[PDB]
Structure formats: structure tokens, C-alpha cells
Design a protein around this ligand. Structure first.
Ligand SMILES: [K+]
Ligand SMILES: [K+]
Ligand SMILES: [K+]
Ligand SMILES: [K+]
Ligand SMILES: [K+]
Ligand SMILES: [K+]
Ligand SMILES: [K+]
Ligand SMILES: [K+]
Ligand SMILES: [K+]
Ligand SMILES: [K+]
Ligand SMILES: [K+]
Ligand SMILES: [K+]
Ligand SMILES: [K+]
Ligand SMILES: [K+]
Ligand SMILES: [K+]
Ligand SMILES: [Mg+2]
Ligand SMILES: [Mg+2]
Ligand SMILES: [Mg+2]
Ligand SMILES: [Mg+2]
Ligand SMILES: [Mg+2]
Ligand SMILES: [Mg+2]
Ligand SMILES: [Mg+2]
Ligand SMILES: [Mg+2]
Ligand SMILES: [Mg+2]
Ligand SMILES: [Mg+2]
Ligand SMILES: [Mg+2]
Ligand SMILES: [Mg+2]
Ligand SMILES: [Mg+2]
Ligand SMILES: [Mg+2]
Ligand SMILES: [Mg+2]
Ligand SMILES: [Mg+2]
Ligand SMILES: [Mg+2]
Ligand SMILES: [Mg+2]
Ligand SMILES: [Mg+2]
Ligand SMILES: [Mg+2]
Ligand SMILES: [Mg+2]
Ligand SMILES: [Mg+2]
Ligand SMILES: [Mg+2]
Ligand SMILES: [Mg+2]
Ligand SMILES: [Mg+2]
Ligand SMILES: [Mg+2]
Ligand SMILES: [Mg+2]
Ligand SMILES: [Mg+2]
Ligand SMILES: [Mg+2]
Ligand SMILES: [Mg+2]
Ligand SMILES: [Mg+2]
Ligand SMILES: [Mg+2]
Ligand SMILES: [Mg+2]
Ligand SMILES: [Mg+2]
Ligand SMILES: [Mg+2]
Ligand SMILES: [Mg+2]
Ligand SMILES: [Mg+2]
Ligand SMILES: [Mg+2]
Ligand SMILES: [Mg+2]
Ligand SMILES: [Mg+2]
Ligand SMILES: [Mg+2]
Ligand SMILES: [Mg+2]
Ligand SMILES: [Mg+2]
Ligand SMILES: [Mg+2]
Ligand SMILES: [Mg+2]
Ligand SMILES: [Mg+2]
Ligand SMILES: [Mg+2]
Ligand SMILES: [Mg+2]
Ligand SMILES: [Mg+2]
Ligand SMILES: [Mg+2]
Ligand SMILES: [Mg+2]
Ligand SMILES: [Mg+2]
Ligand SMILES: [Mg+2]
Ligand SMILES: [Mg+2]
Ligand SMILES: [Mg+2]
Ligand SMILES: [Mg+2]
Ligand SMILES: [Mg+2]
Ligand SMILES: [Mg+2]
Ligand SMILES: [Mg+2]
Ligand SMILES: [Mg+2]
Ligand SMILES: [Mg+2]
Ligand SMILES: [Mg+2]
Ligand SMILES: [Mg+2]
Ligand SMILES: [Mg+2]
Ligand SMILES: [Mg+2]
Ligand SMILES: [Mg+2]
Ligand SMILES: [Mg+2]
Ligand SMILES: [Mg+2]
Ligand SMILES: [Mg+2]
Ligand SMILES: [Mg+2]
Ligand SMILES: [Mg+2]
Ligand SMILES: [Mg+2]
Ligand SMILES: [Mg+2]
Ligand SMILES: [Mg+2]
Ligand SMILES: [Mg+2]
Ligand SMILES: [Mg+2]
Ligand SMILES: [Mg+2]
Ligand SMILES: [Zn+2]
Lengths: 104, 208, 99, 138, 124, 83
RNA sequence: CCCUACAAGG
RNA sequence: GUUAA
RNA sequence: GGCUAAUCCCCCAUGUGGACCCGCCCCUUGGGGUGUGUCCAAAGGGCUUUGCCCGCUUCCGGAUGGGCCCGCGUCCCAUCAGCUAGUUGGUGGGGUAAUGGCCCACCAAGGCGACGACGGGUAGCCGGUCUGAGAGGAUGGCCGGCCACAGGGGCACUGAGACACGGGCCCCACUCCUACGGGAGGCAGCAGUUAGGAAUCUUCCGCAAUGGGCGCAAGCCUGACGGAGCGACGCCGCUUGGAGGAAGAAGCCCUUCGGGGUGUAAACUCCUGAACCCGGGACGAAACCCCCGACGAGGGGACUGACGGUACCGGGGUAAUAGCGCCGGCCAACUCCGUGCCAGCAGCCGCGGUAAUACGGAGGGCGCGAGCGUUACCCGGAUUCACUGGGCGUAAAGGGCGUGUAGGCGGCCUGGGGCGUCCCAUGUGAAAGACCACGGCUCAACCGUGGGGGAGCGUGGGAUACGCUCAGGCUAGACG
């Protein structure tokens, strides 16, 4: 079955393309602790139907471009900018880790 | 190959009478008769409290010299017994007892285990009608170990079987003196053997 | 030394030449038709287009341009012509596009 | 604020039994009560009961102990010799039915919280289900 | 450490250093004698221990021990190194194998002969 | 094409073949599509030739081409008998 | 070789 | 001065 | 430059059908159907010659093989922290069997990173293998699977398939042949040479068997393979003898000089017969083919063995290799002489300074035995990187203190969802290996057949205690 993942939209700054952040939690292979890891998928949005903050379903698809092999199946719910925020701050945080940081 | 050396010196070392010559090991002279102490220049000097290791090593060297097997084969049999179901200790003796050269001895065809070995190597023996010259061949319950026809006349085989007349044989075996043929009925029970060996110590020796 | 099957090399050379010459005829005509359609020359364009079609399919009979590769060309070709013509003229000779 | 209300209870019990208290109170909660049910059933404790300490709901756990003893240190043997948390916040422990442990060859127990409710390792094995391995007792 | 810390940093598999850079971790290495010296042992001991400075095919130049009472090594003796240090000679971590190359086996040796490279003498 | 042939599995001076369905292009002792019988050329056992007759019939029906020897054995086992 | 097995001394 | 008992 | 055949190439026709554009219908990414228009087929050969065989054309489907895509998993360094322009996405083209920045034109300004991007180091990955009670650690030689490469780099042609180890082209290095213009070549195939190295074999036999390519067949090719050769490199089986034999030769070692040891060991008697010598002598091989039958089923017939005159049988028949390590403790096994911190031993502890069970020899002893030791490396013991299974007052270890970002963790009650978690069924889990059973070589090693396995992941269904998420409530934490 083509894979179907659920994730939040953290970017719509691309034409007909949305970055879907996808999480998954599972027992750490050695320490047991249920850890939580995630990945970003560039999904196809031909109608530019999906907006920043949307929690959509993503589905395996015939390559649309390099780096892009999933199409947005549907909307699960929306207006979840809380999720986008987390992602954004995590990213914001990073620019304060090297010799080019700043904010405390 | 096998040991091939002074054997009554082994009995002396082990402080127990091992029968490695069959006859004479009954005469007033298995040396265990005169000088049942270890061989060498210090054989009589006061003995020292053996280390737990020493005890096992000897008990094992004892149980192995009795059958005259290399350490190579001995250990392999032991390992086979460990893998097998049921008390390793007995099963091990079970297997040791199943060696053809040994069975030949238990049926009297040969006066000693070493003699038995030669009898097998030189093809004067036979399992289920067929010749078998492998001292280590494993005899299975039901097999019939017999003296080869061509050799049912060897002066040696006469005597040994003549002497077998009216002699009892292990409970797990059956001997037909007239037809110079015997049969391995079942595996001996530990209680069927009277080995001057505490097989457990042997097991411990290998746990080290 | 001397593996006589360098005869394979010889042949490859001729085949190469045969293929090469077929494809050129194909490109050249295809261009010629799309060129006429892009000018409204309906009857003339379609006329040639069929040649291209014929040459392409013929090419597909052997190794030259065997395959869906043929289809792809017929397709792309019958597409640019009809589109170019619609952007002006009418399918006169109609010797290829369907009503 | 406690971080492991369960661990808290296992300890309140462990600490109390260790000084031979008659009973001991623990902040109330259904899940906690359910665990208590088994301890009672299993005979590790005399039993328990809801009670209200200063207006809030607690659970008096009535502890058990063996008889007074001989020689020096006549303190009685413990019924609950060992009560240990297994799964914990930030290291939850889950087991499939074929992975449910056998505490002290059966002499002790394991308490898992399954989707069929909280069960002793035997009750779990019986109903053929696994779950979160809460703790162990003996 | 907490489980979280273990998840974040895990444990560290620590590796061991070779007590014998005979490069390729070859069991032995060939070389030529650069110098044939004598050396004094440490503290508890006293003696004129025999050592050789060998230039290895492994590109190394290490000092190796010359076991045995005999010994016929000179500034160009080609020999085989094996590894095995000398508790008494800090710095000496290899032994020269006797009976191989220009290294004569110890003569008249009658006991641990296979070490020291000494063939079996005729008995009668 | 796809084939029904013998794969060597005995040991020196002791061959034991597995009658197999493998792509013709694959090494003989390599990955085969499916075992369908066995053959002991020295008949050192009353059981020296077995063939899943139905399975064989299936492959023949789909194009599997049997080696001459494979075909001999297959026949001895009744794969081609009609009655 | 004098000391005590030495080093250092004669 | 060192090394031992 | 000229001649010429075909299953070589082309034109026309036939159009079962198929391809393409447009339309409609079904279906849902380019799947299937249908209508008009257009476009597209072909090769002959053999004879037991009026009818069969081999083959050719188009189409649909099967079978096998494969391409591309996606989830998850896959070493060390953070003394590598920021990386990115075909870079990320778009529209339209090109290319391919096919999707795709794969390539291009143009537009947009994006994509990636502490869940470790980028850089550096190392490395083909698996089935497995070794070790370990397990968890785990280490590993990837032989065999099977996948990938990658063919002197180094780039490239396409031919073809169903290659960007092709024994095909092609160019550049580079190198070798060889040159009449100096210019050419030829690539063992990481088998064998062999040489170099490097501690170290790794025959320029062997055969195509008989299995397997492959071409052929209607006969049959031809096949260093694939089946065998033989060399190396205790490993594993397993075997020998160097068996029984008798003295209060106990000699020699040699100890000694209190009485005697004790080597030791039934030898000698010697008798018995059996490794080697060898004769005679017999394989299995692996029955197909292809041929005849009957119908070129089918079925039934007959003939050819064929490298290994090898080997295995194995039967007859005769000699008493016929033993070494190596070790003996202070750990660790099984002690005395004498020599030596005198010397010569030397030594895995760790240590031993030798004039009576050394520790050095060197000897006698004796212990261990293992066609081996025994040594060195190197891996796991173990080492809960000594501690998940199972450790620690930090003084042993190594609390950050000099706070604030607080990400993150980790989260009180009591009810309800929704069912992500984690648990349960059933089912698909997958190649073979070999491992395990068990039985069986084939006289045993075993080795090998055959059969049995049993599971984690993980996919699919359908189910559960909801706990963790999660959403919604509501609470007041015991917190704050006011
Ligand atoms: K039509
Ligand atoms: K087809
Ligand atoms: K596929
Ligand atoms: K594009
Ligand atoms: K690995
Ligand atoms: K592995
Ligand atoms: K026939
Ligand atoms: K014979
Ligand atoms: K003799
Ligand atoms: K002296
Ligand atoms: K000594
Ligand atoms: K180790
Ligand atoms: K400090
Ligand atoms: K600081
Ligand atoms: K619920
Ligand atoms: Mg957008
Ligand atoms: Mg695109
Ligand atoms: Mg057992
Ligand atoms: Mg040709
Ligand atoms: Mg042109
Ligand atoms: Mg607790
Ligand atoms: Mg406790
Ligand atoms: Mg760990
Ligand atoms: Mg010095
Ligand atoms: Mg000293
Ligand atoms: Mg060493
Ligand atoms: Mg001074
Ligand atoms: Mg000293
Ligand atoms: Mg011409
Ligand atoms: Mg013509
Ligand atoms: Mg043609
Ligand atoms: Mg038609
Ligand atoms: Mg039609
Ligand atoms: Mg459609
Ligand atoms: Mg259609
Ligand atoms: Mg149509
Ligand atoms: Mg036509
Ligand atoms: Mg495109
Ligand atoms: Mg395309
Ligand atoms: Mg690109
Ligand atoms: Mg991540
Ligand atoms: Mg990197
Ligand atoms: Mg590499
Ligand atoms: Mg361990
Ligand atoms: Mg392999
Ligand atoms: Mg390359
Ligand atoms: Mg090369
Ligand atoms: Mg090249
Ligand atoms: Mg290249
Ligand atoms: Mg092509
Ligand atoms: Mg190439
Ligand atoms: Mg080549
Ligand atoms: Mg060399
Ligand atoms: Mg070879
Ligand atoms: Mg052949
Ligand atoms: Mg063939
Ligand atoms: Mg040839
Ligand atoms: Mg071979
Ligand atoms: Mg070797
Ligand atoms: Mg004798
Ligand atoms: Mg003969
Ligand atoms: Mg036959
Ligand atoms: Mg034959
Ligand atoms: Mg033939
Ligand atoms: Mg006929
Ligand atoms: Mg026939
Ligand atoms: Mg005779
Ligand atoms: Mg000792
Ligand atoms: Mg001296
Ligand atoms: Mg020594
Ligand atoms: Mg020693
Ligand atoms: Mg052997
Ligand atoms: Mg460990
Ligand atoms: Mg360590
Ligand atoms: Mg721990
Ligand atoms: Mg510690
Ligand atoms: Mg201190
Ligand atoms: Mg400290
Ligand atoms: Mg502090
Ligand atoms: Mg926080
Ligand atoms: Mg909670
Ligand atoms: Mg939370
Ligand atoms: Mg769920
Ligand atoms: Mg499986
Ligand atoms: Mg499964
Ligand atoms: Mg398998
Ligand atoms: Mg058998
Ligand atoms: Mg099997
Ligand atoms: Mg499911
Ligand atoms: Mg809930
Ligand atoms: Mg709430
Ligand atoms: Mg209130
Ligand atoms: Zn005796």
C-alpha cells in the first residue's frame, strides 16, 4: 500500500508545494525509553489548497520532482500554528549555537 | 595414535587399580599390589593436599585412561553428551560404553580394552554380519557383535571364549559363547557400571 | 589475438548508419510539419505530418526507433500540429488528425 | 507535585512496612486503588479503604507481617519483602504476553496494566494479554 | 546517568592500543640490525641484557631482545621480529626469533629447544 | 528461458542433485525459483528419485524447458504419462 | 684478592 | 651510597 | 573502381490487430472500452515433398529477468556547525521503456541542519560466522544473494538487454614494435612468472557427469564444472602393536650407601598383521540419437568414465614413525650438579648476590600427541561504557552560582479519538548454515531427506488499563 503519513504544514513558500512535518514515536532500540523522531516531506499541492498550520495526510506518489514523492491526500484539521511555532523556534534556536548565534 | 606406553604406571598414579592388561592385573602383581604409590623418584615422599583442580583433573584422567581414548575424542564425546538430553554424567558413560572396541571387551572376546582395540583394527570383529575395524564405531541397541568367521579359529579367540564359558556378562549385554557372538541389548544404566570414577568431578573439570 | 567476432563491430557500424539516417529523415520532416502548421498551411502541414508518422512507425519495425518511443514521437508531433493549426487554420487535408 | 504517584505508593508502603506501622495512607486515585485490590487479593496486605484526610481522598493500606520472632531482633518477617517499580515516567516498560516475567518461580508476582485491566502476571497470562509492566512484589 | 542522557549520549565503546606496532598486525616482521647493543635492567635487577636495534620492513626502527645465551648478530644481520616485551627493559617490546634468517639458533640447547630454534641432536 | 534442471548438492565423489526450476542464465548451484524433486544418481537409498509431479506439470505448462537429463528423471517419475 | 652480595674506598 | 633477609 | 546472393535493406498491398490525435463512456495519476481520421506487418529454409518440420509477421496474455520510486535500519570525529545556484519549487520543452533539475529555457526564492546538515576519517552490505547465560561484542574469508569495478579518466555505438573484463573511440601513465611518419597492448578468467610480504599451490586431467551458448540433428565450444597434484592450513578417522614377563638385568639418576627410581618398561615367549605383493574390480550412465508407435504416451535398441586398474572385495604378508611444551604461585608436575645480581628466565606476581624445586644440563614427573609450542588478532572472563547490569562526601567523578531557551518529565475526575501499548488472523521471513530426527559412505568428518523455528515489516479485525491527544471539571502542586 502506498504509505500514508500524517503531519503539519510548516511551509507554503513554494509554488504548489507544502513542507509537511511528520512525527513518530517508538521504543528506543536499546534503552527502551519511548523516544520521538520526525522528518519533513515536500508534498504536492497543485491547487495550492493547503495552508501553513494545516494537519494533512500525505501519500506515497509517483515522483513529482527530485526531493518530492508525496501528494497531500486530505486535511485532517487546521489552525494549529502551535505546531508550526514549535518547529520555527527549534529552528530559531539553532542560529544561536555556533559562532553566528545571538538570542538567549 | 593411542597411548602405547607403560600402563601399570598409570594405575599407580591414579592410586586406583585400572585394568589395562586384563590378566596379570589379577595376579599378585598389578603393581597396585606392590607399590600402589605414584611412579618416579618421589613416589613415596609424603603427599600434599591436592587442589580442587588437581582432584578433578585426576578423576578425569582416571575415567579416560580406563577406556584408553585420546583427550581429543574423550572431550568430543563429553561435548556430545552435554548437548544431549538427560544427565550428562551418565549419558557420557553411556557413550563411552558404546564404543565397539569397548563392547568387544565387555563380551570377553578380548581380555583387555587395548587387545579389543587390536581385535577390531585387524578386522577379527563384526557388527550385524559386516566387518568393522573402527575401535570408535558406536554400537546401537540391537546390534550383534561377533567374532569374524575367518578368525573363529585364532588360538587367542579360542581361549578368551573358552574362558567366557560359565562367566556372567553385563546386564545390558547377552553373550552366546558357542556362536562367538554377542548382542548389545540396551545402554548401561549408571547403576549397571562399577567404575571407580565420580563422573561429576569430570563434568566440573570441563566447566572451569 | 584475433577474435573474428569483431564482425560484430563491423555490423554495428552499418546499423549505426542505417539508424542515424532514418532518425534524421524523421526529425527533418517533423520539424517541417510543425513549421507549416505554425504558419497556418493546414493541408500542406498535415500532408507532411503523415509522412513523419509513417517514417516513425516504419522506424519502429526494427531496432532504429523501436518502442513506445515511436508512440511518444507520433504523439508529440500530432500534438504540436493540431495545437499550432487551431491557433488559426482549419484541418483541411485532415490526413491524420481525427475529426 | 509527585512525578510517579505509583512509585510514590509503592514506596510509602515499602517505607511503612519497614518500621512495622499498622497502616499507611496514600493520596487517592483509581489506578492506585486497582493496584491495591491485587495486593489485598494476593495477601500482601490486610486490605485497604478510602478515607478522607483533611478533606482530601486517601487510601489507608493495612499492612501484614509474620509472627514475632526468636533470638535477637524479634522483628517479624515481612509479607511484602520486595516491592519494586519497573515501568517509569521516561522509561515505560511494555511486554507482550510471551514476555511477562515469572517472579521468583511463582512465589512472587508481577503487576501489569493491560487493556483488559490491571492483572497479576498469572491473570494476564490466563487472559492471554500483555501490557505495561507496573511493578513486582514478593 | 538518566535513561534520557543514555539516549542522548549513549555509552562509549573504548578501544585498546596495540602493545605491538609490527604494523599490519602481522604476527612477525623482518628487518635489519642497525646496532647490536647491551643494556642494563631496571632497579631490582642487574645484568648485561642483549638487545638489537632493528630497521623494519614495516618502516619502523625498534629495539628487539636477543633471547638465549648464544647469539651471533652484527650490524647487518637480517632477522625476524615477533613481539613479546621484556619486563626489565623499558622500551623493549619485541623478541628476535632465533633460528630464522641470520639469527643462529642457540647451540647445545637441549630443553625448550623449539624456542631458541635448536634442532634435535642425535641420541644413542 | 526458465528451466527445470539439476543443481549439484552432494559432496566430492558423492553427488546429490536437486531437480530445480531456475532461470537458464543463473549459475547452476545458485538461487533457483523452486525445488521440485531430488535425485541420487548412485541410488544409495531406496529413495533416490522424488518429483513433485503436479508442480512439475505446472512449470512445464508455463514454459519451463527441461534439461535432457531433467526430462529423463521427470518421465521416470510419471510426469509425462497419459493413460 | 681487603671490607659486605655490591657500590665507593685501600 | 644500592639491593636483599 | 567493378560484379553478386540471401532469413540483408527498401516500396506497394492485405489490417487479425496495434500505435497516435480528438470525442464519449467506465475507471481513477498515463488503467480499460469505443467512434471517426491517420499510421504500421512479414522470410524463407528442410524433407520420409499435396503436408509435415524448423522459422518469419502483428496482437493479447503467461512465465522468468530487470529498471525506477517510497517507509524504516546501516561505523568514528562536533578539536567538522552552519551547508546550498541546478541549489528548492513552478510552467513549458528535451531525453528514456519509464517518473524525476535527469538535461534546457524562462519564473519564483526557496531547500537542508543540533532528531547532527556540511566537512573529515574508515568501510562494499547481507544470509551468516566467532564469542557470550543472555543482552551484547567482534566479523563479512570459503558457499549463496545484492552492489561496484575491469591499468587511471571521460564517451557513446550496436542490441531485448551494455554505456560492455577477453567490443569500439579520446585523453593520461606504462610496455613493446618502428624505415620515427605511425602503430600494438591491459590475467581483479585458469595455470604460471615477477615484485611486495611473516605468508598462500599445478604453466595438471577430462568434457565422462551437472550446467551454459549455437545447431533439426549429428555435434562443436565451455580453465563454468567434475577430478587429480602440492601445503598437518582446518576438521574427522587410523597406525607405530596385543597377551605373558622379576620383589625387578644392565645403563643412567638419587642415597643417610641400608637402599629408592626409571619399571613389565626392556630382554625374551607367544599371538595378531600398518606397510607392502598378487588376482578381481566398480557406482557415478542414461538420456540426446535410432526402431515400433503418432517425431506424443508408452515400449525396445545402441554409444559414452577424466577420476582409475582408484574405491571396495578376496588371497598372501613384515612388529613395523614420536614428538613437543611444561614442572616457584596462578597451574598438573622435584631432585642432583653447574652457575654466583653473572650467564640468563619472565604471561602477571617475580627469580639469579656461593647449598636456586624459578637460570643451564641431567634423572624423575605432569600435559597433549602427528602433533606440540610461539607470535598476531577477535569474543570471553570485564557489572572494567553497567539496556539486562556501575557510579560521583574522603577512592576517578557535582558544573563556582543563578536565570532561563530547546528538550526530557507531569496532580485528581469524566468523556472522544486509538499515536504509543497489548491481542487474533494472515502475507513476508530464498537456499545453505544452526537445532532435532532418521538415513548414505565400515565410523566419523562430510553428505542426504524430513521436522520445528522466530524477531522485524505489510494487511484485516479487535482491546483501551497505562502513556499520548482533544474536550470538560476539580483544588491537594504552583502562583496571587
Ligand atoms: K479507425
Ligand atoms: K509476452
Ligand atoms: K519490479
Ligand atoms: K519539468
Ligand atoms: K556489520
Ligand atoms: K551482524
Ligand atoms: K519414447
Ligand atoms: K588383505
Ligand atoms: K616391536
Ligand atoms: K658452587
Ligand atoms: K631446576
Ligand atoms: K580480552
Ligand atoms: K570542581
Ligand atoms: K566555569
Ligand atoms: K478512553
Ligand atoms: Mg505556495
Ligand atoms: Mg516537476
Ligand atoms: Mg546433557
Ligand atoms: Mg559469427
Ligand atoms: Mg536536416
Ligand atoms: Mg518505587
Ligand atoms: Mg522493594
Ligand atoms: Mg548501554
Ligand atoms: Mg639501562
Ligand atoms: Mg634481582
Ligand atoms: Mg607477550
Ligand atoms: Mg653518595
Ligand atoms: Mg638487586
Ligand atoms: Mg563500390
Ligand atoms: Mg533479390
Ligand atoms: Mg529482415
Ligand atoms: Mg483494423
Ligand atoms: Mg479491426
Ligand atoms: Mg481516466
Ligand atoms: Mg481511451
Ligand atoms: Mg479506435
Ligand atoms: Mg504497409
Ligand atoms: Mg516534464
Ligand atoms: Mg516523458
Ligand atoms: Mg539537479
Ligand atoms: Mg530527524
Ligand atoms: Mg558525514
Ligand atoms: Mg575499500
Ligand atoms: Mg557479559
Ligand atoms: Mg560469497
Ligand atoms: Mg573505473
Ligand atoms: Mg593490474
Ligand atoms: Mg582504460
Ligand atoms: Mg575504466
Ligand atoms: Mg538501441
Ligand atoms: Mg567499454
Ligand atoms: Mg583479460
Ligand atoms: Mg620476498
Ligand atoms: Mg588448488
Ligand atoms: Mg560437458
Ligand atoms: Mg551438456
Ligand atoms: Mg578452444
Ligand atoms: Mg575444481
Ligand atoms: Mg600452510
Ligand atoms: Mg608389553
Ligand atoms: Mg589389485
Ligand atoms: Mg547404471
Ligand atoms: Mg558406470
Ligand atoms: Mg552425447
Ligand atoms: Mg515410426
Ligand atoms: Mg523413451
Ligand atoms: Mg605369520
Ligand atoms: Mg602444583
Ligand atoms: Mg657462570
Ligand atoms: Mg623455561
Ligand atoms: Mg617456572
Ligand atoms: Mg588426528
Ligand atoms: Mg562488558
Ligand atoms: Mg577498560
Ligand atoms: Mg544502568
Ligand atoms: Mg565503579
Ligand atoms: Mg585527594
Ligand atoms: Mg576526589
Ligand atoms: Mg556545588
Ligand atoms: Mg520547558
Ligand atoms: Mg498524567
Ligand atoms: Mg507533555
Ligand atoms: Mg493504535
Ligand atoms: Mg521463516
Ligand atoms: Mg510473522
Ligand atoms: Mg532458511
Ligand atoms: Mg549411518
Ligand atoms: Mg534441511
Ligand atoms: Mg495490523
Ligand atoms: Mg483520554
Ligand atoms: Mg483539563
Ligand atoms: Mg475554586
Ligand atoms: Zn595394572
Amino acid at each position: 500500500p502506498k504509505k500514508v503519513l500524517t503531519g503539519v504544514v510548516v511551509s507554503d513558500k513554494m509554488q504548489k508545494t507544502v513542507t509537511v512535518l511528520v512525527e513518530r514515536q517508538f521504543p528506543h532500540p536499546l534503552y527502551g525509553k519511548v523516544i520521538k523522531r520526525s522528518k519533513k516531506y515536500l508534498a504536492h499541492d497543485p491547487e495550492e489548497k493547503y495552508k501553513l498550520g494545516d494537519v494533512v495526510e500525505i501519500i506515497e506518489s509517483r515522483p513529482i520532482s527530485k526531493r518530492k514523492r508525496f501528494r497531500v491526500l486530505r486535511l485532517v484539521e487546521s489552525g494549529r500554528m502551535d505546531l508550526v511555532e514549535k518547529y520555527l523556534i527549534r529552528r530559531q534556536n539553532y542560529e544561536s549555537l555556533s559562532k553566528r548565534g545571538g538570542k538567549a | 595414535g593411542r597411548y602405547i606406553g607403560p600402563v601399570c604406571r598409570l594405575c599407580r598414579r591414579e592410586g586406583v587399580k585400572l585394568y589395562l592388561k586384563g590378566e596379570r592385573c589379577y595376579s599378585p602383581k598389578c603393581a597396585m599390589e606392590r607399590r600402589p604409590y605414584p611412579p618416579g623418584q618421589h613416589g613415596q615422599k609424603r603427599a600434599r593436599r591436592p587442589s580442587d583442580y588437581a582432584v578433578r583433573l585426576r578423576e578425569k584422567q582416571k575415567l579416560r585412561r580406563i577406556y584408553g581414548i585420546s583427550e581429543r575424542q574423550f572431550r568430543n564425546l563429553f561435548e556430545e553428551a552435554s548437548k544431549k538430553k538427560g544427565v550428562t554424567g551418565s549419558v557420557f558413560l553411556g557413550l563411552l560404553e558404546s564404543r565397539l572396541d569397548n563392547v568387544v571387551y565387555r563380551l570377553g572376546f578380548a581380555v583387555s580394552r587395548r587387545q579389543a582395540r587390536q581385535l577390531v583394527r585387524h578386522g577379527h570383529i563384526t557388527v550385524n554380519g559386516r566387518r568393522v575395524d573402527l575401535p570408535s564405531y558406536r554400537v546401537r541397541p540391537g546390534d550383534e557383535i561377533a567374532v569374524a568367521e575367518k578368525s573363529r579359529n585364532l588360538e587367542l579367540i579360542r581361549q578368551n571364549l573358552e574362558a567366557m564359558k560359565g562367566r556372567k556378562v553385563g546386564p545390558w549385554l547377552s553373550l552366546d559363547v558357542e556362536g562367538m557372538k554377542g548382542k548389545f541389548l540396551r545402554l548401561p544404566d549408571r547403576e549397571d557400571l562399577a567404575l571407580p570414577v565420580n563422573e561429576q568431578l569430570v563434568i566440573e573439570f570441563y566447566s572451569r | 589475438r584475433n577474435l573474428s567476432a569483431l564482425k560484430r563491430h563491423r555490423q554495428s557500424l552499418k546499423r549505426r548508419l542505417r539508424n542515424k539516417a532514418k532518425k534524421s529523415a524523421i526529425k527533418t520532416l517533423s520539424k517541417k510539419a510543425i513549421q507549416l502548421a505554425q504558419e497556418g498551411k493546414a493541408e500542406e502541414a498535415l500532408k507532411i505530418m503523415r509522412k513523419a508518422e509513417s517514417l516513425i512507425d516504419k522506424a519502429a519495425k526494427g531496432s532504429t526507433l523501436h518502442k513506445n518511443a515511436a508512440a511518444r514521437r507520433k504523439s508529440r508531433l500530432m500534438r504540436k500540429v493540431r495545437q499550432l493549426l487551431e491557433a488559426a487554420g482549419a484541418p483541411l487535408i485532415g490526413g491524420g488528425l481525427s475529426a | 507535585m509527585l512525578t510517579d504517584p505509583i512509585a510514590d505508593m509503592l514506596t510509602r508502603i515499602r517505607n511503612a512496612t519497614r518500621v512495622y506501622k499498622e497502616s499507611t495512607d496514600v493520596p487517592a486515585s483509581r489506578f492506585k486503588e486497582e493496584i491495591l485490590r491485587i495486593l489485598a487479593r494476593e495477601g500482601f496486605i490486610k486490605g485497604y479503604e478510602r478515607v478522607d484526610v483533611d478533606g482530601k481522598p486517601y487510601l489507608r493500606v493495612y499492612l501484614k507481617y509474620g509472627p514475632r520472632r526468636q533470638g535477637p531482633d524479634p522483628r517479624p518477617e515481612q509479607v511484602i519483602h520486595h516491592i519494586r517499580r519497573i515501568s517509569k515516567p521516561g522509561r515505560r516498560v511494555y511486554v507482550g504476553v510471551k514476555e511477562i516475567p515469572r517472579v521468583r518461580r511463582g512465589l512472587g508476582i508481577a503487576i501489569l496494566s493491560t487493556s483488559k485491566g490491571v492483572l497479576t502476571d498469572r491473570e494476564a497470562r490466563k487472559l492471554g494479554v500483555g501490557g505495561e509492566l507496573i511493578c513486582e512484589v514478593w | 546517568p538518566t535513561i534520557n542522557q543514555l539516549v542522548r549520549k549513549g555509552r562509549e565503546k573504548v578501544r585498546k592500543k596495540s602493545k605491538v606496532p609490527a604494523l599490519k598486525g602481522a604476527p612477525f616482521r623482518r628487518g635489519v640490525c642497525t646496532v647490536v647493543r647491551t643494556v642494563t635492567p631496571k632497579k631490582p635487577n642487574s645484568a648485561l641484557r642483549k638487545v638489537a636495534k632493528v630497521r623494519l620492513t614495516s618502516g619502523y626502527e625498534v629495539t628487539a631482545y636477543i633471547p638465549g645465551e648464544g647469539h651471533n648478530l652484527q650490524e647487518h644481520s637480517v632477522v625476524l621480529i615477533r613481539g613479546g616485551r621484556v619486563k626489565d627493559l623499558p622500551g623493549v617490546r619485541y623478541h628476535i626469533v632465533r633460528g630464522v634468517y641470520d639469527a643462529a639458533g642457540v647451540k647445545d640447547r637441549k630443553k625448550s629447544r623449539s624456542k631458541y630454534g635448536t634442532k634435535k641432536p642425535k641420541e644413542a | 528461458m526458465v528451466k527445470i534442471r539439476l543443481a549439484r548438492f552432494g559432496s566430492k565423489h558423492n553427488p546429490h542433485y536437486r531437480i530445480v526450476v531456475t532461470d537458464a542464465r543463473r549459475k547452476r548451484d545458485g538461487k533457483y525459483i523452486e525445488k521440485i524433486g531430488y535425485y541420487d544418481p548412485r541410488k544409495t537409498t531406496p529413495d533416490w528419485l522424488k518429483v513433485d509431479v503436479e508442480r512439475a506439470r505446472y512449470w512445464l505448462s508455463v514454459g519451463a524447458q527441461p534439461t535432457d537429463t531433467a526430462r529423463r528423471l521427470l518421465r521416470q517419475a510419471g510426469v509425462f504419462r497419459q493413460e
